[PDB]
């Protein structure tokens, strides 16, 4: 229908130049796709209540950030427990259950050279409490990441390390830091004090571009909706900042004082959700997919090869979703790096992977709880149907939609190799 | 892994270029072609190429389609030539490395206003003798194609109709002719008499471009190696013409008097084979695939969606081949329209589809004759492995190579929807 | 590397590390972002004009001299506040601060005066707007920022209220509501330019949609070759704090990257504790953002979207901008009476500064609306031979350019002139080497 | 109607594929033929009357093959060419200059041969404009030809013929010291596999276009026309593809030297080249030439790109340029404008040599001088406009781009002007 092609900035998406794309942007073209940029909310006194955390999960919070610069281990353990209680209160309905990752943000090495002794103790606390992600403060070189990795020990091998770039050295040694990190955070607060304030946007845009090229998650952080700490509505500069972080290519956007200590934590999450949805429809996919495709090197890894085939197939038919089965989240991450317009519905049995895939733009995790079927192909089919039924319930899919289904040839991680075109019945 | 020597062959430095101009500048006479020749050679069978022994030499030299010109000879003469072609083709049923299907094409005498009486009788002869293709002379409008289609009786609806555009009217009404035809032949002999000789190249390039856009086969014909009727080597203009027909986007190249009456029929086939191989490596796939992709409309047909995903996957890993299971040839034709560098190995049970897919550039048919397995998934696997083993035997594949496999979810034509990435073991 | 090798050996590797030149040579926008370098210092003069709203914090002649030195190009007088007497005194103080630098014509900086109307409030032009518009004509304002423009007839009403004596005043239509956005094309057609008035726009339409309206309007104005201003809350927190937030610097940079010709300061300069520091911050961000513009795609897209033209000024402008990019020209010196020849150069977004030499004091103030235009007011009486008068004006631009650091010995400059006196005859482009 | 002619619908296409799809056999070429025709002069094309017919048919450069004939024979051919050329000098607004090119025998079994030294000396003595140097294998071969031309042959253009594997492999070093290149397909097709010649041709044409130096496509382009009145389908395609590849010149050898249809072969090349030039996809070509061309601080180079950009912006009928050596016209030609480059020169040699550059139409200025240099320039510019009007390039109401310098003498081009005709 013509109405379908007027929504989600589709006239602007068909443009032959970026300039014509901008000219075709329409404030009356409503977003239809699910919001794909994850929201990280910092936990604090304004957002620790189990009832308030349920409201924040409903508003769109995907990752709960524990800022280890404030509070003791006992404070952070109560934070984790309240987060988990609010998250599990929705587990009774598996088709709508929303996993929420827990991220530990370290205090950092102040005047110190390597990992501080408080960071070693906090990192071990994170492993003991099962945190999914570490936002490592003031990462200046590859050896800082290795030290964080070593402090996590053998039991924390699965924890994702997102390096926070907060100073000139981190920006200059960015390539070597990205190579050993799982992702990056553009920590604009310290960065804006360490380098001239008028240069932070160059560092943000460069880091987001390089992370998009590398296919690794990038978070835009600090003062995105600052005035909402005290005011019910943000400034014109703040909504523009959130929209531009999404247009830049950020996988995640963050709220600090806005959720940790402010008077409007739920509204700040709702505002980021509303802006991100509008900005995602305004992305010029024609140029973006072409440039990601051109820049990505050749690969002999079947997961990487299946991912680009599936993203190309999704664009060809305007697929509502790409449903992928994943154990570690890697197959969903490889789909996400090509920035499909189609939602990537990731079905997994790993509760940790379901939480961690929120780092990748456009990945919607579904935690599958059923015990395995005796026939492996039936187990695969049951999981795919769970993705379809959840997708229908949540509004991602309707009967008649085309979906791309990504699976593997045998059980266990690392064997994704199949792409299949499916009609929703 | 593949080595620097691999990336110096088949014009790979010219293929990585960012502009067409830089691509031309990087063309290297020392960069040897490695891929199998993908543009089919149509040879006109006449007194110089009629004998079974001469036909075996022409099959070995590269002839894919035998053309019988019903403007000359008689029904009895052409039936004997057809029987000699089939005898020479079946003499290789012993060695899988030498057995290659050869299509039989009937070229009509032509039109008075509508279809001629002789054409009706010749078309009936073609149906009775099981011809695969009809090259319909002097097609001027859509109703001419409908008349040929009606003349293909109750038993010849599977025969492909390739409309020969030979005059101003055919050029002007090209779009309506292409819409109802299976393909087109740029019949340059009559076209060069009907319109100014200096305009034929415009008509050739336009028709090849529109056929490439439509995903329908296009043949370049007449005087390609004319001087080889009497001389053992062609002129500089002739080799250039063959190379440029391939670079233009032609699916097939043809030999007329060169093979029908000339002194060097086998040498003319060998020359077309040598030039086509060199020209195919010189194709600028980066721009071609992007333009075919951009111009092709969105599709909700799973075969079309799977085909673009498979071609994208093949380029990503430098796949040696795309193995496709097809009954009518349609799934192989849809892969061919995106012009993959990978060979499209089409595994089929249909002897007719195996001969007809020679019309599509880059399609290597394999006729499968094993009895169907009781379990459909095992029958599919047996055919996929047949494509791999024939590929290994013929030099398309080696252990460790990556192949793309295109299949459907259920038996019968019209259900292709799966693309798998396979490692050759 | 071959397309820059000889120029790299000549100008040096240090030259090609500055002003985001490695990012500018990128083949894709993605690679351009990846090559952005915080250590690549801006060299070019700041080309996006700063509009500062004048109020109690920025009214004194001494404070205005500091704001002119910090980079203020246009002084805005908001007729929603104050009075005729109050605004006349602010205007006189702006003119006194501006003329304190007139002693040296080779370095003098013109400042435009813009009147922002109160608006229609609760259908047509209000009676207060008619009186304020008349005040503007009587006080010789250069620009009118017309509030709440909703249709083409609103701009015709403002034009009529300016009368025959205000024919030269530029009308910049403020788009502040849904109707203005929907009828944008008809409004732009009859306006001299547009202002994305985000304060009211953010109340009239959902706050999360303002960025779509801003980006669309800036893109359409860039396509039309007409000035566009980004306004409201750009550095809001600087009303009370000496440093802005991370979102505020980002907003200023993104307005410039979007294609805005001007950026504005409202409460930041009208009532804030740091008016000069707010101007300095906008200046610092705009210079960094201008160097980060991906000119390769921008110039190609402006060129591809612009229709063919038989107007020699339009034809000369694209030839001059192409020539400037080819040699990395330090400047394009253009002679203009109305500012139009400089505006046509500005629409192709050259990296080279457009030094506009004019005898019209009003055109010198008004060209601040066009990105990258640096006005030079020529005060000498005309030479007897017209060709010598033209040559003197070109040399005035070169000497001012050398004195201000815009030009250096060895630089190439593009000079744009016409074949006969009077407006509308620009048709010549010359390549000159600076000695 | 203007936008239906000269493949303008195909020129507005957003992709090369859509450009091909929009090519129309009914879209007639309007622009003057840009690719020069080189005709080999021999027994079939030696008479003054036959040469007048060949000049009228479109011959721009007369080639004398020093592998055949003798010094006396070639001197008589040269005198006949000059007599046929000067028979049109009575009307200076329509006079067509014709270059004279000497094609050397080559080194054969051996540096520069002794016959080549004598033939090169003959060329200097007879005032030839160009040398097509046979079997150039390396940069030192070009230096040897340059030395054999001596001080009196400082201004003869050396076009290196690439005829073997070594010439192809050492192409970059040869192009660097040569004025241009000839893709000599006859020997090249014997020296390397015949099926690889198209790769060498396309590579060399691309590199010469990149370098802004003339490239000639040669041998067997219309071979069958040696005995038949019409060419084959492969032959017309070859001529069209050489033009679409980016060749500045196309050549006729036996077709004009010994063939039964020399005038018809020239007419056929003219007809094909005109059709192929309109079919060029300028949108991609100009963009790629622009992107690949390096940044420059030379004002002639800077003015040239500004003038070509301005010409495309207004659909200028022509770019009128004043040149002494032909260099300013060559720098305009390298950007492949659709607008004709009308080069007004006082140098008879530069007028002949500038036929090597695609789209350059030389006008030999023989009008009285103006006392004021500024008046003399304006007169040479109005001369371009009167010749352009007479020859069909320009009409009243057309826009032209005029390229001049700031001071007399070569090397000072720095001005571009937009002018309305009459
Ligand atoms: C004025 O004759 C014409 O009609 C001109 C003509 O060009 C035909 C025409 O004379 N041609 C075009 C074809 N070539 S051909 O490709 O070499 C050719 C030859 C033959 C045969 C087919 C064929 O294509 C053949 O089947 C045959 C059968 C039995 C004995 C001999 C032959 C035979 O010689 C010969 C020259 C046209 O337009 O066809 C309608
Ligand atoms: O993204 P990952 O972690 O590589 O997981 C992909 C794996 O998931 C699957 O689709 C399903 O595997 P399981 O049955 O073990 O869950 C495998 O076939 C595939 O290899
Ligand atoms: O190209 P076609 O004619 O549609 O044939 C493709 C068909 O071949 C298959 O891959 C195999 O089917 P069969 O087992 O019937 O041969 C189907 O699943 C698919 O629909
Ligand atoms: O930009 P505008 O307003 O058209 O002015 C450009 C005009 O300025 C000139 O360069 C100089 O003209 P004046 O001598 O009138 O100042 C004219 O030749 C040209 O027409
Ligand atoms: O192309 P060339 O050889 O550099 O010649 C261009 C020269 O021609 C002119 O336009 C006219 O010069 P002349 O008056 O000497 O003929 C010069 O101003 C310019 O330097
Ligand atoms: O650490 C942070 O979040 C910062 O500095 O912005
Ligand atoms: O019929 C043909 O093949 C022709 O006319 O070229
Ligand atoms: O009117 C204004 O300036 C606004 O609304 O921002
Ligand atoms: O010398 C030549 O021209 C050739 O060999 O083609
Ligand atoms: K912290
Ligand atoms: K026939
Ligand atoms: K106001
Ligand atoms: K010779
Ligand atoms: Mg910090
Ligand atoms: Mg025919
Ligand atoms: Mg307002
Ligand atoms: Mg030779």
Coordinates of C-alpha atoms in Angstrom, one line a residue, chain C residues 2-7 10-11 16 25-27 294 296 299-300 303-304 306-312 314-316 318-320 322-328 348 410-412 414 427-432, chain D residues 3 12 14 210 283 286-287 289-307 309-316 334-335 397-399 401 406 413-420:
Chain C
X2 CA 48.5 10.3 -6.9
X3 CA 45.8 13.0 -6.9
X4 CA 47.7 14.9 -4.1
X5 CA 51.4 13.7 -4.5
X6 CA 52.7 16.8 -6.4
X7 CA 50.8 19.2 -4.2
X10 CA 55.0 21.4 -2.8
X11 CA 52.8 22.5 0.1
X16 CA 47.8 18.2 4.5
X25 CA 40.2 13.2 0.7
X26 CA 38.2 10.1 1.9
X27 CA 36.3 8.1 -0.7
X294 CA 32.8 16.4 3.9
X296 CA 33.7 16.0 -1.7
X299 CA 30.0 19.8 -3.6
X300 CA 29.1 16.8 -5.8
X303 CA 26.4 20.3 -8.3
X304 CA 24.2 17.3 -9.2
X306 CA 21.4 22.3 -9.1
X307 CA 19.7 22.7 -12.4
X308 CA 21.5 23.9 -15.6
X309 CA 21.7 27.6 -15.8
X310 CA 22.0 30.2 -18.5
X311 CA 22.7 33.1 -16.0
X312 CA 26.4 34.1 -16.3
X314 CA 25.6 31.3 -11.7
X315 CA 27.8 29.8 -14.4
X316 CA 30.9 31.9 -13.3
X318 CA 30.4 27.2 -10.2
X319 CA 33.5 27.6 -12.4
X320 CA 35.2 29.7 -9.7
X322 CA 35.6 24.3 -9.0
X323 CA 38.8 26.2 -9.8
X324 CA 39.3 27.1 -6.1
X325 CA 39.0 23.4 -5.0
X326 CA 41.5 22.3 -7.8
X327 CA 44.3 24.5 -6.5
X328 CA 43.4 24.7 -2.8
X348 CA 28.5 25.8 -3.7
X410 CA 52.6 31.8 -3.1
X411 CA 48.9 31.3 -2.5
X412 CA 46.5 31.1 -5.5
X414 CA 40.3 33.2 -7.7
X427 CA 30.9 36.7 -15.9
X428 CA 34.7 36.6 -15.4
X429 CA 36.9 34.3 -13.3
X430 CA 40.7 34.8 -13.0
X431 CA 43.4 32.7 -11.4
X432 CA 46.1 34.9 -9.7
Chain D
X3 CA 16.9 17.4 -25.2
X12 CA 20.9 12.4 -17.8
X14 CA 21.8 8.1 -12.8
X210 CA 44.5 9.8 -16.8
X283 CA 28.3 12.2 -16.0
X286 CA 33.8 13.9 -16.1
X287 CA 33.5 12.9 -12.4
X289 CA 38.5 12.5 -14.7
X290 CA 38.0 15.2 -12.1
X291 CA 38.5 12.8 -9.1
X292 CA 41.7 11.2 -10.6
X293 CA 43.3 14.5 -11.8
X294 CA 45.7 15.7 -9.1
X295 CA 45.5 19.1 -7.4
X296 CA 47.4 21.8 -9.3
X297 CA 48.8 25.2 -8.7
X298 CA 49.3 25.9 -12.5
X299 CA 46.8 28.6 -13.6
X300 CA 46.3 27.0 -17.0
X301 CA 45.3 23.7 -15.4
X302 CA 43.1 25.5 -12.8
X303 CA 41.4 27.6 -15.5
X304 CA 40.8 24.6 -17.7
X305 CA 38.8 22.6 -15.1
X306 CA 36.8 25.8 -14.2
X307 CA 36.0 26.4 -17.9
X309 CA 32.7 22.9 -15.3
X310 CA 31.2 26.2 -16.4
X311 CA 30.5 24.7 -19.9
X312 CA 28.6 21.7 -18.5
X313 CA 26.6 24.1 -16.2
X314 CA 25.1 26.1 -19.1
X315 CA 25.3 23.5 -22.0
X316 CA 27.8 25.8 -23.7
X334 CA 41.7 16.2 -20.9
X335 CA 38.4 16.9 -19.0
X397 CA 21.7 33.1 -28.2
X398 CA 24.2 30.3 -27.4
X399 CA 26.5 30.6 -24.4
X401 CA 33.2 29.9 -22.4
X406 CA 46.6 38.0 -18.8
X413 CA 46.3 31.3 -19.5
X414 CA 44.3 32.3 -16.3
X415 CA 41.0 33.8 -17.4
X416 CA 37.6 32.3 -18.2
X417 CA 34.6 34.4 -19.4
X418 CA 31.0 33.5 -20.0
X419 CA 29.8 35.1 -23.2
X420 CA 26.4 35.2 -25.0

